Amino acid sequence: MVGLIWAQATSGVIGRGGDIPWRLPEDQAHFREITMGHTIVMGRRTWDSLPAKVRPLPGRRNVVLSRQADFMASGAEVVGSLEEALTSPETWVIGGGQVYALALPYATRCEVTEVDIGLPREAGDALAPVLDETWRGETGEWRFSRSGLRYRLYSYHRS
Ligand SMILES: NC(=O)C1=CN([C@@H]2O[C@H](COP(=O)(O)OP(=O)(O)OC[C@H]3O[C@@H](n4cnc5c(N)ncnc54)[C@H](OP(=O)(O)O)[C@@H]3O)[C@@H](O)[C@H]2O)C=CC1
Ligand SMILES: CCc1nc(N)nc(N)c1C#CCc1cc(OC)cc(-c2ccc(C(=O)O)cc2)c1
Ligand code: NA
């Protein structure tokens, strides 16, 4: 099972200027409960964006995709291809834009957090992949963040 997990503005934006363009602590907790104890796969830019205090993300096997054959990072398994990245029976792809697109055809689950923030797309933004008719989803009830954004959870699957 390969799953994709991301948080996106309604607009589809997941990243800008190398950052996630909002704060949503509740989403982190959700992310942790999905990924804990599993292999996670991420592109090199997403690895770089992890705060040093949690690079690698603890309790998870950190797998980092890079085309740099000699790229190394403490606590991460650097691999040069997706095939090398997806060998664990349960694998969660945690970003970013490039790697979601790369892994999408291999995926049968998506766990999405929608953030109700006004954030029109800008050129060069990292974006969420588009889920077509092959996917079924269940939409969670809107929740209200400690800071004030409304957000909700989607679970998508295809068999
Ligand atoms: N909202 C969310 O849920 C998330 C948001 N983000 C945001 O996403 C943005 C970064 O995403 P993005 O910019 O798309 O970059 P990625 O995080 O997808 O990493 C891209 C890198 O992955 C490597 N790579 C890509 N394709 C391949 C391949 N086919 N084979 C081998 N290596 C490959 C390259 O590394 P090299 O260049 O070293 O070869 C490339 O530069 C940031 O803004 C981040 O904050 C990140 C994660 C989740
Ligand atoms: C939490 C953000 C997030 N939400 C959802 N739904 N899906 C994702 N794939 C990511 C992601 C990501 C990259 C990232 C960036 C970051 O700051 C740049 C922090 C984390 C992060 C840090 C700590 C923990 C943890 O303590 O478990 C988890 C994620 C993770
Ligand atoms: Na829900």
CA of 31 to the centre of ligand 3 (A): 13
Side-chain half-sphere CA neighbours of 6 within 13 A = 30
Which of the 8 DSSP states describes residue 100?
Answer: H
Distance CA 7, CA 41 (A): 16
Find out whether 117 and 9 touch, Cβ atoms under 8 Å: yes
Instruction: Report whether residue 47 contacts ligand 2, using a CB cutoff of 6 Å.
Output: no
Would you list which residues are annotated within the binding site for substrate?
5-7, 27, 32, 60, 100, 113
Hey, what are 38's tokens? 């599993």
- Architecture of the domain whose range is 1-159: 3-Layer(aba) Sandwich (3.40)
CA of 134 to the centre of ligand 3 (A): 22
Instruction: Report whether residue 52 contacts ligand 2, using a CB cutoff of 6 Å.
Output: no
If we measure between CA atoms, which residue out of 6, 11, 14 comes closest to residue 155?
Answer: 6
Sequence-distant (6+) residues with CB within 8 A of 158 are: 108, 134, 135, 136
Please list the residues that pair with 43 across neighbouring strands.
65
Would you list which residues are annotated within the binding site?
5-7, 14-19, 27, 32, 43-46, 60, 65-68, 80, 94-100, 113
- Tell me the residue type at 127: L
Note the resolution in Å, 1 decimal: 1.7
